[PDB]
Structure 1
């Protein structure tokens, strides 16, 4: 379909999201600039938990994004009803990309204009995944999304190594946003979430501020 390529055009116009799979965890940093000072930046969140162990982030269209945040969380908890076990990250990406593929097959709708970076931690082992608006999903070591994702994907390919820790992966995920930020990021205009063995959590801005001070 042509609407899938045009939906990928709305993803590449979105804000940068960078996710890096470290040895002991996965980061998911995004670009969150407010258009003016009138907007409460505390209010809306881009990095978003799905379970206690899976979070995700996007580039593209936020209202399309919340539709799959809601349905990822439903698929996850209806897995948990059946198995009483937290859902594997790869299984959840199969479910969500099946949902995201459904809106490309049916006529009278458009595809999602959103591409997800699903992170996870299951069985002592981290996961980085990207679901495209087609319904296709790819496992990643590190990747970029949104505005100039190509330049981010080759900035990551230079600074990625496998024996990398989670804190150093936060440091090189801030740098991949900072290669395209346009104007001096702060703890109030980016948003990072990490998975580790303790589960997924979105970093508090006081905790983002010290990572930014380390750079």
Structure 2
């Protein structure tokens, strides 16, 4: 037996600390969230199909405000989301306090990488079992993935969760940086459909976005999401034939 994941203070002789790739596996087993970044803003879409009907089916939340102009979404343990989102909200506000600018998408992302690596490096505290999307507009639309490791990846579009892989492939084919907001939203709804392997409802997904001409956080209301969703089911159906 291996002993390179009994704790995190070790590596295998291959050079791969298995335990922080296992924190990555935490992410895969949890549930989908997609960021779709275009030049007119960034869109953030995340699961709200969680649980049964015993539960609230407008369960709060998977679409967190960090400010009014940077937002974030999650997969992984939502225990570990709740507290990391908390850390992320204080971190962005501390910038506002000491500099008084909108904290930038790049800067929030690098602070939270530092923050995960504190837990990662010590053995007396486990790593986070959470991955995060940080979507914002500082003034250029931007999208990052931050790993349970503490690593920072810029993407044209990115997904996390269960459905990660199908979405990666989905965009491998259609996605382009030249695509409209309308277009970009409907394509990410098609992909969100594949992730849950079923047709979408506008009561089953929670949607936020940070727009370029606003530079603000807004949450998509139920009946304003309904036509984007409505046209998507047609394409979703064709793809579920296969």
- TM bracket (short chain): over 0.9
| Most deviating of 142-151 and 127-136 | 142-151
Match of 2:207 in 1: 192
| Most deviating of 10-19 and 189-198 | 189-198
| 2:191 is aligned with 1:176 | yes
Match of 1:129 in 2: 144
C-alpha displacement at 1:117, in angstroms?
0.8
CA distance change for structure 1 residues 32 and 42 in 2, over 3 Å: closer, same or farther? closer
TM-score (norm 1): 0.95
Flag structure 1 segments of 5+ consecutive residues without an equivalent. Answer: none
Once residues 144 and 89 of structure 1 are traced to their aligned partners in structure 2, the CA distance between those partners, rounded to angstroms, is 18
| 2:93 is aligned with 1:93 | no
| 2:85 is aligned with 1:69 | yes
1:88-139, CA deviations, whole angstroms, 9 ceiling, x for partnerless residues? 110000001111121111112211111111101012x100000000000111
C-alpha displacement at 1:151, in angstroms?
1.9
Match of 1:59 in 2: 75
Match of 1:109 in 2: 125
| 2:27 is aligned with 1:11 | yes
Match of 1:209 in 2: 226
Q: Are the counterparts in 1 of residues 58 and 204 from structure 2 also a CA contact under 8 Å?
A: no
CA distance change for structure 1 residues 206 and 177 in 2, over 3 Å: closer, same or farther? same
1:17-63, CA deviations, whole angstroms, 9 ceiling, x for partnerless residues? 11111111011111221321111123411011111110111111111
Q: Are the counterparts in 2 of residues 56 and 119 from structure 1 also a CA contact under 8 Å?
A: yes
Q: Are the counterparts in 2 of residues 25 and 165 from structure 1 also a CA contact under 8 Å?
A: no
TM-score (norm 2): 0.84
Once residues 144 and 43 of structure 1 are traced to their aligned partners in structure 2, the CA distance between those partners, rounded to angstroms, is 21
Once residues 209 and 108 of structure 1 are traced to their aligned partners in structure 2, the CA distance between those partners, rounded to angstroms, is 48
**Alignment of structure 1 residues 122-161 onto 2, 5 Å:** 122-123=138-139, 125-161=140-176
| Most deviating of 189-198 and 45-54 | 189-198
Computed over aligned residues only, the root mean square deviation of the Cα atoms, in angstroms, reads: 1.3
**Greater length-normalized contact order (CA 8 Å, ≥ 6 residues apart):** 1
Flag structure 2 segments of 5+ consecutive residues without an equivalent. Answer: 1-16, 233-242
Once residues 17 and 89 of structure 1 are traced to their aligned partners in structure 2, the CA distance between those partners, rounded to angstroms, is 18
Q: Are the counterparts in 2 of residues 15 and 32 from structure 1 also a CA contact under 8 Å?
A: no
